[PDB]
Ligand binder design. Sequence first.
Ligand SMILES: [Cl-]
Ligand SMILES: [Cl-]
Ligand SMILES: [Cl-]
Ligand SMILES: [Cl-]
Ligand SMILES: [Cl-]
Ligand SMILES: [Cl-]
Ligand SMILES: [Cl-]
Ligand SMILES: [Cl-]
Ligand SMILES: [Cl-]
Ligand SMILES: [Cl-]
Ligand SMILES: [Cl-]
Ligand SMILES: [K+]
Ligand code: NA
Ligand code: NA
Ligand code: NA
Lengths: 147, 146
Amino acid sequence: AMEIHFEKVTSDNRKAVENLQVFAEQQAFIESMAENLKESDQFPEWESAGIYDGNQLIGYAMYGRWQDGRVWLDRFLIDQRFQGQGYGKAACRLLMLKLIEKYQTNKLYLSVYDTNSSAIRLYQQLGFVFNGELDTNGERVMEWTHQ
Amino acid sequence: AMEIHFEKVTSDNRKAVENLQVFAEQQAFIESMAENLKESDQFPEWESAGIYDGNQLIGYAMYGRWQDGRVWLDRFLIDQRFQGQGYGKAACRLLMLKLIEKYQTNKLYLSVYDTNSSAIRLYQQLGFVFNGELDTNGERVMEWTH
Ligand SMILES: [Cl-]
Ligand SMILES: [Cl-]
Ligand SMILES: [Cl-]
Ligand SMILES: [Cl-]
Ligand SMILES: [Cl-]
Ligand SMILES: [Cl-]
Ligand SMILES: [Cl-]
Ligand SMILES: [Cl-]
Ligand SMILES: [Cl-]
Ligand SMILES: [Cl-]
Ligand SMILES: [Cl-]
Ligand SMILES: [K+]
Ligand code: NA
Ligand code: NA
Ligand code: NA
């Protein structure tokens, strides 16, 4: 019957884990977000934010200065009820400007999966370019430079 | 009118953020999971594992013993393809036994959202009980004492 075992995440299975299908587990993603928030609250390097249009919460973002001094956009979500209507790009641009005002640097960093075309296009339109680096999770790094 | 602004997450809006309707966004999940793995790999307290049935990846776990001294079950997911087949109970039970061996403790902790009926049931069936504590995110803590 069942042969349940656990494996450390490595390059051999990381992408399989990243592609775990979970597109109905509404209660599960509640738990995912609660942990997301807990993990951000744990370390002062990280900060979570709700994204609002007026009084309506439309999304979420996590970001922060990592130890190397690089500033990262770690998570960025728009609620499904509000997608396809220019919120992501508008919110992402504003977040970018807030980050480079908060911190000294004029560079921001993120990493993307090699198939997330909907997101890559958004970040590309906002000035993010692939910089030839790989993140620790094997994702391709993108970098926004201000000038 | 479009009026975009950003608010710190506090008790005023945390549960609103926790309930963001992002459960139908496939590509968003890949990034969410990738970020989970990045954060897990960063801190030695935390460990991520794939859950397998033989050669089939069926789920994901994240767990850690933090500076406080308690061992937590931080993240636990079963792929929606293999839901409702008993993999939740069996894998969680096996994971519990792994952690009390790996660490010195005979206790394990998790926290759950109140409206999560399946989770509270599942965890209770395995021996977890509400211990009257609140987590940092406002979730009710459950505890399993071996
Ligand atoms: Cl195992
Ligand atoms: Cl695999
Ligand atoms: Cl849009
Ligand atoms: Cl590019
Ligand atoms: Cl490149
Ligand atoms: Cl703002
Ligand atoms: Cl608060
Ligand atoms: Cl998608
Ligand atoms: Cl979870
Ligand atoms: Cl299950
Ligand atoms: Cl109980
Ligand atoms: K999770
Ligand atoms: Na990333
Ligand atoms: Na780790
Ligand atoms: Na929790």
